[PDB]
Design a binder for this molecule. Structure first.
Ligand SMILES: CCCCCCCCCCCCCCCC(=O)O
Ligand SMILES: CCCCCCCCCCCCCCCC(=O)O
Lengths: 149, 149
């Protein structure tokens, strides 16, 4: 991944996000509800490390989860306990494109449970470079459900 | 779906095809190997009805399958025993875009086990109109395996 947000102010990504679309390099990273990269972002809490609240389906349950992405020399790049989180683009107010890699998955996050075509076309343009083999998107009804059910 | 091949000569789609990419309106139509619209086209045999040889994963097996799409008043539209098959576009030599609907799934077929970007971008342009929520694509290795394993 060769796209990163110049001048990312991590404080300003704080609060509520919705996983509107997801893509991955391999189908099995996203194909089932229990697929490894099938994580739904709930809330981003910058400490300047980054606390992520996400939902994730495990052994027949939607589980609420709290993880820390440690900051790096680069403001737009964080690490996870192996896995690099890259923030590609964000306008802070409406959307945020990020990828994670050790296997590569990218997401289009939005502030509100709505379908944002402006954001999805930025997401699409940003995956054109990447070797993605699965893409998903969720309707507003699924954005309000635990684990996008 | 509002895109159909003008002047389709069905005889000329005869022979060998590879399911290079697939999209569907609902994730559960494509997400597992046993998902309903997760069918891999092997061979198209026009009689002028259309005989399809496809592969389909059922109860832990890749099953070879033979079905008939009955012709309609419209050359580019066929029916299946409920389900409409629409041929959107084909150059006969390299690629063929088709959709099926009762739930909507579209595929980008190619003559050879290779990744055709020209064809995938035509596929992408053709799904821009459609309310797709899952897309898959397969590498050349998977195109040569039973059920794209
Ligand atoms: C801008 C920051 C975006 C947020 C990035 C979220 C990435 C977190 C995903 C990491 C996967 C860890 C999930 C739990 C581990 C597991 O169940 O195996
Ligand atoms: C240009 C023609 C393209 C070929 C169209 C192929 C569509 C066939 C898919 C129909 C699904 C039927 C599969 C078996 C039925 C089942 O297992 O439920």
């Amino acid at each position: 991944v060769t796209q990163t947000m110049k001048g990312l102010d991590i404080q300003k990504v704080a609060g509520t996000w919705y996983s509107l679309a997801m893509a991955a390099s391999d189908i099995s990273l996203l194909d089932a509800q229990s697929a490894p990269y099938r994580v739904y972002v709930e809330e981003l809490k910058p400490t300047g490390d980054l606390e992520i609240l996400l939902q994730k389906w495990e052994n027949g349950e939607c589980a609420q989860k709290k993880i820390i992405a440690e900051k790096t020399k680069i403001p737009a790049v964080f690490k996870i306990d192996e896995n690099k989180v890259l923030v590609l683009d964000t306008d802070y107010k409406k959307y945020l494109l990020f990828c994670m890699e050790n296997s590569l998955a990218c997401q289009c996050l939005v502030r509100t449970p709505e379908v944002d075509d402006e954001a999805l076309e930025k997401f699409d343009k940003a995956l054109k470079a990447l070797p993605m083999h699965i893409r998903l998107s969720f309707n507003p009804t699924q954005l309000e459900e635990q684990c996008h059910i």
